[model samples]
Target chain A: SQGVIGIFGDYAKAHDLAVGEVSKLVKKALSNEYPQLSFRYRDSIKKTEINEALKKIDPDLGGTLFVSNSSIKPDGGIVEVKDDYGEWRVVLVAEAKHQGKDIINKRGDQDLMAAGNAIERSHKNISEIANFMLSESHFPYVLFLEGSNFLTENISITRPDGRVVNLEYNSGILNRLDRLTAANYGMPINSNLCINKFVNHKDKSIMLQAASIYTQGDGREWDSKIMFEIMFDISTTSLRVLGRDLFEQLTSK
Target chain B: SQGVIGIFGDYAKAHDLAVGEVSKLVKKALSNEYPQLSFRYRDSIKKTEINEALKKIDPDLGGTLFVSNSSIKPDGGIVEVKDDYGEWRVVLVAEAKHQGKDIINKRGDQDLMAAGNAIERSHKNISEIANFMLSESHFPYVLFLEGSNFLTENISITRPDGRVVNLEYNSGILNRLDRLTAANYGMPINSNLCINKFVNHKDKSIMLQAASIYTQGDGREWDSKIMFEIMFDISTTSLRVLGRDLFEQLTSK
Candidate 1:
C-alpha cells in the first residue's frame, strides 16, 4: 500500500504533473489497466521464504525442490529444478558484433574479408553460448523482445535429443507487458532474456526462484512500488505453479 | 526534412500501410499529436559525417573515449578511467554455476539454515556488483527503462573518495531521447551508452572508438532509413556538443 501509493506520488511529482490525477490513473493501473500477469511477487519473501511457504504446501517441497540465486546465472539468477542441480541467470549477453569487433585489428587480419568473417563467426560464438545454455538445462526460459533489427532470425537450439526449438517471444502476457510498459514509460528496455541457470556439479542442490521471473524495462526508482505490486501478483499466480512443473520435468528427464 | 519524413514513410511501407496517410501520421508524430520531447531528431545525418564532426572534436577522441560495440564491458569498464589500478569489474568474469554460486553455495554450508543465509548473501553478491560499479564510476549513468523491474535500484559507484554517488538518469536530453524512441518505436530502448573498454594490463593505450554502433530495435529492415533520419537529427545538435564535451573530460581527467 505504501509502496504503490508512494511510487505514484513520486512519479507524478517528478513529472510535474498533478498527483491526484496521477493517482487516479495509477489506481486504474492497479485495479484493471495493467496487464493481468500470471506471476506475483512474494512480498517480504526471500527464495527461502517462498521455499518455506511452499514447504507448507507440502513439507516435501523443500526436500525435492529448492531455490537459490548464487549462480552467475539467472536474473536474480533463480534456477528451476529437476535440479538435483545447482541454480539460474538474463536479458542477453554481449553479442559478438558487440563483443570482439576489435579482434581483427589485433590479429593483423584487418581485411574486409576478415571483418565479414568475424561478424559471422562472432554470431556463431554468441549462438553457441545462448543455445548451449538452453539445451543444457531447460529451466531457464528465454524471452526475446521484438524491436532490434540486429538479429534477423529467431534463434533455435537443438537439444541433445535432436529436437530443435526456436526461442521466440510468443507469450501474450509477456509481450503485452512489454508493449504496455514501453507505451507507459516511453522507452526501450531489455528486450530479450535467455533466463539463465547455474549448476553445482558436485552437491546437486537446486535453486529455482520461480518457474521464471523476468523484471522487464529499465530500473527506475519510481517504478519500484508499481513493480512490487505487479510482482506480487505474478508471484502468487502462475509462477507459483511453475515451480512444480519445472521440478517434474527436470527430475523425470 | 527528408530524414524525419523518411522513417515515418519507411515504417508505414514495411507494415503495408499507406504512405500518404502515414505521412499525415508521421506529421502528427512530429507535431502536437506526440508528447513533447526535450530533444528532437534533426532529421538528417550520416554515420561518416557524425564521425568526422567528432573526429574534428579531436582525432584523439577516437584514441581516448572510443564508442565501440566491441567490449564485454559497459559503464563500469568505461571508467577503466586511465586509473592506475587494475581490479574491479562488473558481473560475471566467466565462472563455471556457470561460474561461482558459493560465491552462492558456500553460504549454504547446506543446512536449511545455510540455505537461507546463502540466498540472502547471494543477493548481496548481486547487489555488490550492481552497486560497486555505480559507486566506482560516476560515469555508468544507469537509465533503467520501466517495463522490467530488472536491475532494481539506480546502481551507484564509489569514487576514489569517501563520497557516494548514484549513477543517475540525469540526462534530460538523453532521457528525452529515450522517451521519444520508445514512443516512436512503440517500445523502450537503451540510449546513451559509453559501450565499454577492456585492457589486459596497466600500460595499454586506451581502446576507445566513437564508431561502429548498434542501434538495437526490431530489425524490421524498414527501421533502417528511419533511424538514419533520427540519427541525423541527434548527430547535428546534441551529439556534436556531446563529443566536444566528452573529449575534454576524457583528455583532462
Candidate 2:
C-alpha cells in the first residue's frame, strides 16, 4: 500500500520542487507580457539585503524594519526586479506549506496535541513572513497550502473496550486565514481589502498584493493550474499598478 | 457505541444553546460594570429593523446598505442596548459555526467533494453574515467555531485493491479566516485592523470589533471559558468606546 508520502518520500523536497516549477511558470507568463521588466527568483532574502537595497535607492529611505536575525526564505520563490542602473526591488515573495506526511495511530489527546503543535509551527512561519513583509511595506506575499493535515475528514474509531471515540477535523485553510487580518498582520495597504496599494518611507509606490491559494477537493497534490493563474494575476496586476513611470524607470537602459 | 452526534442530535440546536449561554454571560459581565445601560439579545435583526433604528436616531442617517431580503441571524447572539429615552442600538452581533456530524463511509473523490462543499457552504454563511454586518457598520461580530470538521487530522485508508489512499486535511479554522479581511469583508473600520472603529453615514459612531475564537486542541466541544472571555472583551471594549456621552443619552430618564 503506497500513500502520497510514500511516493514523494520527502515532503519538503516535493514542496520545493513544486514551488520552483510554479516560479518558472510565473516568470515565463509575466516575461512574455512584459519582457522589458526584469524577473528572477531568489531562494532567500535577508533583512540586511533589503536594508542595503533600500539604502542604495535613496539615502533618505528607511531601512527594512524586520528585526529577525535569520534570512526570510520563501518556499515558492522570491520575485525580484532590476533596471540597467543596477537598482533592484522585491516584487513578490511566496510561501508554500505542506503537512501531508506523518502517521499517527493513537487516537488520543497527546496525538492531537502533537498534530496541533505541528500546524501551529507552520502558521508561525507564515506569520513571520507576512509580518516581515508588511513591516517592510511589501504587500504582494502569496501563500500556498496543501497536505493531509489541511484537508481531512473526521473518523470514529471503536476501542477494544467497546467505547467509540470521534476524531474531529479542524476547519479548512480559508478559516485559518481570518487570523491574518490587517489588524493582526500589520497595517492596511489601502481602504480596499481586495487591492493592495501602499507607499514606503522612501516615497516608492507599491501595489503588490497578498493572496492564498489552497488545493481544493480536486486532489491532495498541489494544482499547478491554480498556482499559475493566481501567481500570474498577482504579477500582472502588480506590474500594471507599477505603471509606465516605474516600468520605464526599471527598464530604461 | 455512542458518538457526539448521538448525544447532540441537532448540531444547530447545540450551537444556539451555546450561543445563548455565552450571550447571557456577556450581558451579565457587562451589566455588572455598566448597570446604567440596558442590554438584551435580539435573535435576529432584519435590514429593515436596522434602517428603522437608524431613522429614529437621525432622519439624516442613511438607511442600511445591505441589499439582501433575508434577515441576518447571529447564532452566538446579537447584543443590543437601549437608553431610558426608548432609543435602542445594536452593540454587538455574533455567529457560531460547528461541523461535527455527518458520517461518510466511502472515502472516494465524491466523498471529498461532498465534504469540501459542506465546508464551502459554511464559509458562505460566514461571509454573508460578516458582509451584512460590515455593511450595516455593526463591527462587533464574534465568530465561534467548534466540532470535528474544524479540528480533525488526516487518515490513510487501504482500499479493496490493497492501495493506500491518503486523505489530506484542509487548513484549520484560522487559515480559512483570511478570506474575510476588511478588503474582502467591506470598508475599513479604521486604521487599526485589530480594533474596528467607524462612523456610519448617519454620523452615528461604531466601535464594535470582530474576532474568531476556535476551540483549539482542547476538544471538539465548545469551551465556555474561551467564549466568556472573548465575548466579555468585545462587549466591554465596545461599551467603553460607546463612551459616557452616548451612554448618558441612551440612559437619561
Candidate 3:
C-alpha cells in the first residue's frame, strides 16, 4: 500500500526524469545546429558564479542574486556558449517544478500547504534567476511547471470573518509568470519587443527580456517531447539574436 | 456541529472585520491631517477607471491593467485626493489576504490546495495593483497579509525520484513580496531610493516605487492597530513627498 509519502515520491521521480530527458534532447539539438559555438551543459549555476558574472557587468548588481538560499540550479539544464574570444556566455537556462498531487487525489490541507510551499519556493527561484540573468544581458531562461497546483480548480474557503470566498484558479502558473515578466520586461522596445532597461548603460550594457513558461494539459504530468520542442526553439532563437548582434558589431568596427 | 466549512467561514469573517476596521482608522487619520485636500475613500478602484487613467498617461500603457478578472480592491482602503487644481489623484491603496487555516490544524491536501489557491490570487493582485498604481505616479500602496500560509512550517516531501526534499518555510510571504517588488522596483535612483523607470516619459512621466508588506507573528491573525499605524504612516509619507514636489515646482516658477 502506497502511503502519502510514496505518492509524493513518485511525482518527484517523474519530475526528475522528465527534466533529465528534455535537457539531453535540448543539448543534442543545439550542438548539432551550432557546431562553431562550443556549448557546455550544467545541472545548475552556483550563486557565487552568478554573483561574479553580475559584478563583472556592474559591481553593485552582484551579491543580491536570489531572495532564497538556493542557487540557480535549473531542473532541465543550463547551457553556456564559448565565442571566438574564448569568453563563456550563458545562452540557455531552464527549470521544471511539480506540485499538487494531493489536490488531485482529493486530499486535505496539509497537502495544499505543501504544494503552496513548493510554489512559493519555485516563484522565488524563477523571479530571482530571471532577474539575475537578464541583468547580466542574457534572456534565455525558461520554465516548465507540472501538477494540479499549476491548474487548480475553483476553491471556496471561509475567511475568519465567516464569509466564504471563492478563488477561481484560471491558469495560475501563467498569471504568475505574466506578472513577474511584466514587472521586469514591460518596457517596449517596439511593438513586438519589450525589454527591461536598467538605469544606466554602465550598470547594464544590454536590455533584458521575459522568460517563457509552458504546461501540458491538466498539468498533472510531464511531457518530455513538448519540453524539448520549446527548449530547442528558445535556444535557436537566442543564438540567432546573439549571432546577429555580434555580426553587427564586427562589421561596424 | 461546526463543520470544516464553518471553521473557514469564521476566519473569513475575521479577515473582513480586520480590513474594515483598519480602513476606517486610516481614512479618519488622513482626513484629519490633510483637511485642505478633499479625500474620497473607496472600497476599490474599478478596472475601467484604472485603464482610463493609464490611457491618459499613455495610450499604449492602457488596456492591460490586470491579468486576473478582478478590479483593484484594496482590502484596507483606497483613498483619492482632489488637489488645489481640482484634479483627483490616487493617494493610497492597500490589501489584506489570509490563508492556511488547514495547515495550522494539521489538515490534509485539499486544505493545502485551498490555501495555495488563495496565495496565487493574492500574488496576482499585489503585483498587478502595484504596477498599475505606480504607473499612474502613486506610491502609497501597502499590503497586510495573515494566516498560516504566510507563515508556513518546514515540511519534507518525497519526489517521484524517491529522493526526499526538505522545504524550509522561512518568511514565505515576505520572500514572495520581495521578489515581486524587486522585479518592478529594482532600479536605483540612489543608494536610499530605487524606482522603476518606464520606457518613455510620455508613456510614464514619473518613476515608480515598491509597495510595503507587513505580517504579524506566526501570521495566523491580523492586528488592526499595527495595520492602522502602517497605513497612516504610508499615507502621510506620500502626502509629504507629493506636497514637497508641488511646492518645488510652484516656487521654481
Candidate 4:
C-alpha cells in the first residue's frame, strides 16, 4: 500500500510513462522499418491498417513461390511474400495493357515500382487517387502494392477546374483469379496448382517434382476456395475516374 | 529561481493533484452507472475520425428518411415525414407467388412509427430480425444496446453444420447510438429501429419516428440503413457474409 501510494496511484505519472512507452514502441515497430507507416489505434491516421485487415482476412502468409532463375513465371500474376511481422506482403503486380500507340514515349518504359514511387513522391497524387476511389465508385478499393514487376505510364494535364492532374501507375488492374472447389480440382478457381522444385534424387543434376491438390499450397487449397469478385480495372479505370492525376507528388503542390 | 518556486520542479506533484481531482470528478460522474465498464484512455478517439466513415457507409442513420406515400397520390406517390434521431422503421413480408407457383414471402408492406407502443413493439421485432440476420450471416459484429426502447429477443437456430444455438436476452441488448461519431450514442446494426425523442425541436412531438429509406403502408419500416450494397440484398449478402453470432440473449431453453 505504501509503494502504491508513492507511485502506482499517480495517474499523471502512469499516463506519462504509457505515452513514452507507446511512442518508443511506435518508432521501433513502424518508423524504422517500412517505407510507409502502420496502424496504431491511439495514434491513428499516421499508420495504415491495411495489413492488419489483410492478415485477418487470410492467415496464410507462407505461400511458396515457383521460381526459375530466381524469377517466378506469370502464373500467379500477382504474388505476395511476407517479411518479419509479415509486414511487407511483397505484392507482385503483373500487367498486360492495351495502351496502343500513344503509350510509347521517348522517355522509355518505367517499371511499376518506379512509376508508383514517382507518383507517391508527390503526396497529393496519392491522396487524390485514394479520395477519388472512395467517393466515385460502387465498390471503392485500392491496391497499393509494395513493389514488383508492375507497369504504368505517366500523363499530365490541366483540368477545367484549373487543377493540374497527373496520370501515373497506368499498367494493369481488374484481374480475375479463377476460383473453384474440391469437386472442381484442376478446374479454374480450384485451390490446387503444380509447383516444381529443384532437388537431387539418385544421380546427376535432377529436378524433383510433385503436385497435389491435397497437401499443396495453403490450407485454403482445400476442397474448394472462395471466388474473386468483380473489381475495377484500376490501370485504365483510375485515369478515367480520377481525371488523370495518379502521381502523389502533385498532391504536395 | 524564486519566481519559479512553486510549480516548476513540482510538475509531477502538481500534475498528480490536478489530474487526481479531474480523475475523481470523472469517476464521481460515472459511479452511478454500474455494471457498465469505461476506461478513460490517455488519448481519446475523436468523433470526427470514424464518424464521417460510419456516416458514409450508413447514411440513413444520419436522420434521412425517404418515404413513399403522397408521391403516389396527390403529389403522385410522394410521401413526406420529418426525420430525426429517434425513429422506428418496420418491414412487413407479404406472402406472394414467385416465378410461377413458388409462393415465397414477398415484401408486402412497410411503415414508420410516429409514437408510443408502435415504436417499442416493432423495435422488439427488429431485434429478432437483427439477431437472425447475424446468425444467418456470419460476421461476428455484435453490439449491446442500452435503455428502454431496447427490446427482448430470443434466438434459436441450427446452422447448416448441425450445431444448435440458442440465446435469449431478458434485459434486452443496449443500442449503441453513435457507432462512429458520438462518444456515447450507440445502436444495434441490423434490424433494430432506433426510437428516441431527442433531436431538433420541430421533430419532437412526432418524436418517435424511424431512420429509414422505405416504409410499408402500415407504418412498419424495416431498418436496413446499415446494409444494402450494389446488386445484393441483406439475406444472401450481409447475413451470410458476417458469418458469426456475437450477441447474447437472456434465456437458453
Candidate 5:
C-alpha cells in the first residue's frame, strides 16, 4: 500500500512552486536525506580522472541542472536544466520564486514539505515543458517519470496544480513517455526525437520511426510507439485545460 | 521511506514475521526458495560427448542440462512453471514478503500467534507446486497486482520456472523512446503500459509485428499477443492483461 500510495494524501501541500524551483529545492532536501545518492559533478574545465573530474563540479549535485536556468525561445518560459556537458544552463525566465515566502529563504525552509512542493512543481513543469515542446506542430521525443504513480496512493496531492502534475507522472509508463516527447520535444537528442523529428525539406511529407521498434530500455519491446500519439492527444487536451487563448499565440519553427 | 514501510510495515505485518526478521528471512527464504528456477532436460542417459560438445559451444556458460524429470508433468495444475538446466530464470510470480506485524486476540491467542502457528500451512508462494514451461511462448512480461504484497512493489512477476525477465531498469529511458517513436510513426500509444515486453526484439519490428516481434516476460506480452490474435486485431494496439492459462498447454518441438 505504501509502495503505491506513498505520494498521495498530501498532494496539495506541495504544488505551490514552479517546476524549476521545485527541482532545485527537492535535490537540496533529498541530498541530506540520502547523501550517497547526492553525487557532485565538475564543470567542463575540471580535471582528467573521474574522481577529480567530479570534484570540479558543485558539491551539491542537485545544483547542476535544478539550479541552472535558461531563456525560453519564441516562448517566454524559462527553466533550469543540465546540459549534455553536465553544466547548469539556466534558461530565460522570470524570478525563480514569484509568490513564495521569500527568495532569500529559497532553501531556508527546506523540509519534507518543500521536497513535496518540488516534486509537485517538477510534475507540472514536466507537462508545461512538454506542452511548449510540442506547441509548434512539430512532433517531439522526450522522456520523464510519473506514469506508474497515476492511481497509486503513493501519490498525494496538495492542490489542483499539484494533483494534475502528479497524476501526469503517475500514469502508465508509455502514457507519460508519449506526452513528454510529443509536448516538450525540442530538447536536442541523439535519436532526432522531440522537435528534431520532422518532415524532410525536399519532400516534406512526414517522418517514419517508432520507439517501440527502437525502445532504448530493456523489456520495452512492446508497443512503446503506441504511447507517442496518445501523449499528443493528452498534451493537446492539456493545452485546452490550461487555456485556449494561451495556445493561440505561440509560434514554432 | 516507502521501502522501509513496505519492509517494516506491510510486509512485516502481512507475513506475521517480525520486522527484524526481514533481512535474514528474505535472503534465506529465497536462497533455495524458488528452486524451480533451475530447469532440467529429457533423457536419463549420460551423454559425455554431448557435454563435451556443449563445453566447446560456450566456455563461459558450461554444460549443465540434466534430465531430472522427463516422464512427468503437474497433475492438478493449480500452478505451473518451466525450468531447465541453466542459471536462475525468475518469473516475478509472487513477491515474497517477511517484515511487519499486528495481531488479533481470540481466546487470548492473537492472530499473529495463530498465524505463527499456521505460517507453514498458509504458504503464500505463487503456487504450491509451480514450475512448468511452454514452447513458442514469449517471456519477460508484466502482471497486475490484485492483493497487497511483493506482487505490487516488485513491478514485475516471474514464472518461478527458470525464465529470464527484465524490468525497465531505466523507465525514464523507455518513456523517452515510447513517445519519440510513437510520434514518428503517427501511431498513438499513450495508454497505460503495465503489460510485459520483449527486450532482445526491439529492432526487429518497425511496427509492432507480432509474428516477428514476440512478447516476453511472465507471458504478459505473450498473452497480449494471444489476445491480439484471437479476440482482437493486433493492429488495434491496445493493452490487455495476460493470464496463466495460455502457457499451461504447449509443445516443445
Candidate 6:
C-alpha cells in the first residue's frame, strides 16, 4: 500500500534531511504518538486523507478534495496529531498555481484566501472543507502551506460607494474559518498559515512554521487543553456535559 | 405576615385600581400563584428578599446585601417561577437611591441611573449582581426596573484626551445588558432594566411602565423560551448541561 507522507518538503530541506529520511521520521512519529488516528499522511495534499477527515463529520462530505472534478482543489490533505486536549488535526492546502515559488518573492500565485479570484472557483466547495476542519473531530485549526513563499501582491481599488480599499486581498480574506466560528462560537477557530522565510543552522535552507492569523484568547499562545475544559465549564451545559466532580478533577488544581 | 409581591406595580396602576386596592389584589394573587415564595411586598427595595435570593446561591453570599453601610445593596430579591423550561427565577434589584420617588416624570427623584456621564458607577456592582443572576439557578435573563424613563438628558464634558463630548449616558445606556450576557456568552446577556413612560386611557395618570432597556435578540421583543434552547445547543456542553430530550420537548415545534 502506498502510504501517506506529511513531512513538509521544505521542513526537510531546511533540516538537511533527505526527503525519504524526513518522511520516515514523520511516519514513525505518527505511528508512535497517534496510533488512534486512521489518518493517512501524504507529504503533499492527498485526496484520501481529506476524504477521511471530511467523512468523519458526515460520510457524504469531502467531495471538494476527493471526487474527481474539472475544477481545482485545495493544495494538500490532512494529518492526525493528538494534542493535549483532544485529537488535533492539520490540513495543508497548497497554492493552486505557484508550485515551487519562494514564499516571499513575486511568484504571483493564485489566492485561495481571496474573493472572486482564480481559487474562488474551487472555493465553491469551501463549505465542504469547513465541514471537517471546523468540527469537533479535528482541532479547530486550518493550516495553509503555500507552495509559493507566503508572499502576496497587494490589490487596490475603489467601490462605487467611493471607499478606497487597498490591502493584501490575495491570501488575506479566508472566509471558511469565519463561517465555522459563527456556526459554532466558543471553540477556538484557529485559522492561520505558514509565513515566509527562516534560515536553518548549518543547512541554510529556508523554513517556515504555521502562524495563527486569527484565534481565541491570547492569540500568540493557545493552550488547548486548558481552554477546552474552561470553555465547557462556563457554558450553560456545565452540569450534564461535565459534572462538578469531573471538572473539579482537572480545574481544582 | 406580609408575603412577597411580584406583580409589577405600574402594570397594576395603569389598569386603574387604587394603589392600596392594587396591593391587596396583588397579595391575593401571590397567595394563589406563587405560594412557595416568601417575598415580602413593600414597594421599596426589601433587604429580607435579597437575603432569600442570596441564600439560594448558598447562604454565605447573601450576607453582603443584608449587613451594610453606605455600601450599596441590590434593591430586591429573587423569586422562582416555573416557565416551560426548567425552573424560571427572577431577582429584584432596586436602585439604592429611589426609596420614595414617584415612578414618573418628575419626583425630582434620586438619580440611580444617572450622572458622572457614560457607564454609570452602578456598573461597579454589575458583576456582583450578575454573580447571582447569571448563576446556575436563574433563567437566561436579568431584568431591572429602571424606574425613570428610558430617555436620557444629554450632558457635555471634556474627554481626558481634551475632546469635548456631549451625550446621553442616561437609562438608555442601561441596555448594555453586559451583566448576564458576559456571564453566558452565547445565551444572550439580555440584561436590561425597564425604564419609564406609558400611555393611559381616560381619567389617566402620567404613568411609566418599566421597560427592560438593554436586552438580547429582538430588543423590541424577547423570545426567551426559543433562544434559551438555542443558546445551550450551540455551546460546548449541550448534552450534559441540558438534556437532548428536554430541549427537544420545547424546541421541536
Top lDDT: which candidate number? 3
Instruction: Place model 4 in a CAPRI quality band.
Output: incorrect
Q: State the lDDT at B148 in candidate 5.
A: 15
CAPRI rating of model 5:
incorrect
Judge the docking of candidate 3 as incorrect, acceptable, medium or high: incorrect
Q: Can you write out model 6's per-residue Cα lDDT over B56-84, one digit (the tens) per residue? A: 64442344221222122433322222333
What is candidate 1's lDDT per residue for B91-177, written digit by digit as tens? 111000111111111324333221111111121112122222221211222221221111212344455676554433222211111
iRMS value of model 3?
8.6
lDDT of 6 at B173: 33
Where is the poorest 10-residue window by lDDT in model 6 chain A?
A177-186
For candidate 6, write residues A88-137 as lDDT tens digits: 44423222122222222122344353332222122222323433342321
Q: Which candidate has the top score in TM-score?
A: 3
lDDT of each: 0.26, 0.45, 0.50, 0.22, 0.23, 0.30
- Residue A150 error for model 3, in Å? 9.2
> What DockQ does model 5 achieve?
0.01
User: How accurate is chain B of model 5, given as a TM-score from 0 to 1?
Assistant: 0.18
Which segments of model 5 are wrong by more than 4 Å? A1-192, A195-253, B1-90, B93-253
Quote the lDDT for A37 in model 5.
Answer: 27
Cα RMSD of all models vs. native, in order, equals 27.0, 17.2, 13.3, 30.2, 24.9, 24.4
lDDT of 2 by residue, B1-253 (tens): 4433233323323454476666765665566556677778667665455445434433532232312343445576677676445765456555666544432235563233223212222332333344333323335656565543443344455667887755433433212222222121222221122245332212223222334333332224565545665666666656655564365555547
DockQ of each: 0.01, 0.02, 0.08, 0.01, 0.01, 0.01
